[PDB]
Amino acid sequence: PVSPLKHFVLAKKAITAIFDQLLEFVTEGSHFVEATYKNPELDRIATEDDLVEMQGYKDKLSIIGEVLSRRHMKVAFFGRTSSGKSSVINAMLWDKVLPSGITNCFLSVEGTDGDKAYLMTEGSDEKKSVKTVNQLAAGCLVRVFWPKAKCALLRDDLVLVDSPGTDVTTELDSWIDKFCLDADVFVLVANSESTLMNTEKHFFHKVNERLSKPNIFILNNRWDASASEPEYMEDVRRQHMERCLHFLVEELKVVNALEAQNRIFFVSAKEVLSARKQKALAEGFHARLQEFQNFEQIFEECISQSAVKTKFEQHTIRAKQILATVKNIMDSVNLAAEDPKEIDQLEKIQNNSKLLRNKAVQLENELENFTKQFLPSS
Numbered sequence: 001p002v003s004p005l006k007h008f009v010l011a012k013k014a015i016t017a018i019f020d021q022l023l024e025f026v027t028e029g030s031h032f033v034e035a036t037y038k039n040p041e042l043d044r045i046a047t048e049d050d051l052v053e054m055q056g057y058k059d060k061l062s063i064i065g066e067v068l069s070r071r072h073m074k075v076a077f078f079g080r081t082s083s084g085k086s087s088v089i090n091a092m093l094w095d096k097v098l099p100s101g102i103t104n105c106f107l108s109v110e111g112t113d114g115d116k117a118y119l120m121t122e123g124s125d126e127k128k129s130v131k132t133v134n135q136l137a138a139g140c141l142v143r144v145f146w147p148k149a150k151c152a153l154l155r156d157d158l159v160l161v162d163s164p165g166t167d168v169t170t171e172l173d174s175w176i177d178k179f180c181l182d183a184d185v186f187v188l189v190a191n192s193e194s195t196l197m198n199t200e201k202h203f204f205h206k207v208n209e210r211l212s213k214p215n216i217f218i219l220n221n222r223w224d225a226s227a228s229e230p231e232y233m234e235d236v237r238r239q240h241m242e243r244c245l246h247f248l249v250e251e252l253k254v255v256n257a258l259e260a261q262n263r264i265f266f267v268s269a270k271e272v273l274s275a276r277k278q279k280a281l282a283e284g285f286h287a288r289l290q291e292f293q294n295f296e297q298i299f300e301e302c303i304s305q306s307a308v309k310t311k312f313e314q315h316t317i318r319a320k321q322i323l324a325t326v327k328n329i330m331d332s333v334n335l336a337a338e339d340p341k342e343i344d345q346l347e348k349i350q351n352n353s354k355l356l357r358n359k360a361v362q363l364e365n366e367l368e369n370f371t372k373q374f375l376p377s378s
Ligand SMILES: Nc1nc2c(ncn2[C@@H]2O[C@H](COP(=O)(O)OP(=O)(O)O)[C@@H](O)[C@H]2O)c(=O)[nH]1
Pocket: 079, 080, 081, 082, 083, 084, 085, 086, 087, 088, 099, 100, 101, 221, 222, 223, 224, 225, 267, 268, 269, 270, 271
């Protein structure tokens, strides 16, 4: 019943809440070391470098919470010109959000809390209309926005990118790569009335090196075309599987023979879009639909968990470090303060420093709790 994308959205709210308290806490502590340092009748209870540190952490942490809020999961599709890239995309969003046929630039599909479908382009924030400007409009990206109220995936922080045929483009496999580098999952949409090409395999060889251990799915689309032929279907499947397994397991070495059974699917996007646009059959239609729904399930488990790790961990780590250093600073103020009536200013200094350090520990415990739920194995 429960979309595994929920995992990413929950992680996102935790780390955003934690960083909200971190900025609050470090602002509080920054005023304290400032007060202590600037107090004329104190010798060197808090130093100027104590203060430059805190202010630095202060300036950092605001913009950190400013980024994770915009953090989303990204899936990018590749394949030859009529393999069914946009159809797979439209099948996952239960609607014809993108049109088949052609263009030659990337198309992302985002969510809007807003209610009308629309389209933006590069360096212009004017909201052009969804599908009339579709035909018309060193890479090139146009961004489609569809109402989050019409698709769970877009509600749940997923962005889906369409790429131009890998057939028809070289200038290399490079601006493609710096459109992709954000991406948590790469889907190869292959035409199953055909055979896995080397122009498609080479692009993924590029991604394989430039990025460490990418998640890749192979969708053998158009599996209609091979329908009704139950034993012919079994033997064609075997050959596609043998070529796909080889690529993932022995060529890209990106996965082992077993988990690769969870990366290769035989699917008919057209059929799925139909039965889904339908909520107002050839042989094996339901079987096909179930395999597509298995892929979606497995894909969501994979992208949710992966994107939590590669988009939130290093901020978690960095926050632990910030908290560590600020404990050191509280520790040293408390210590310098232990070495008339000045005495009761220092003891009050000492009490507030301990207050602060125990706040640091409290926040440290939450970070550690976050890492337990969301970052195995802590
Ligand atoms: N028969 C059949 N046609 C399909 C299937 N998937 C896509 N198509 C058709 O193939 C053509 C090109 O598909 P499209 O989704 O635009 O592929 P793309 O251009 O690579 O994004 C369109 O006419 C689609 O309706 C399928 O599973 N079966």
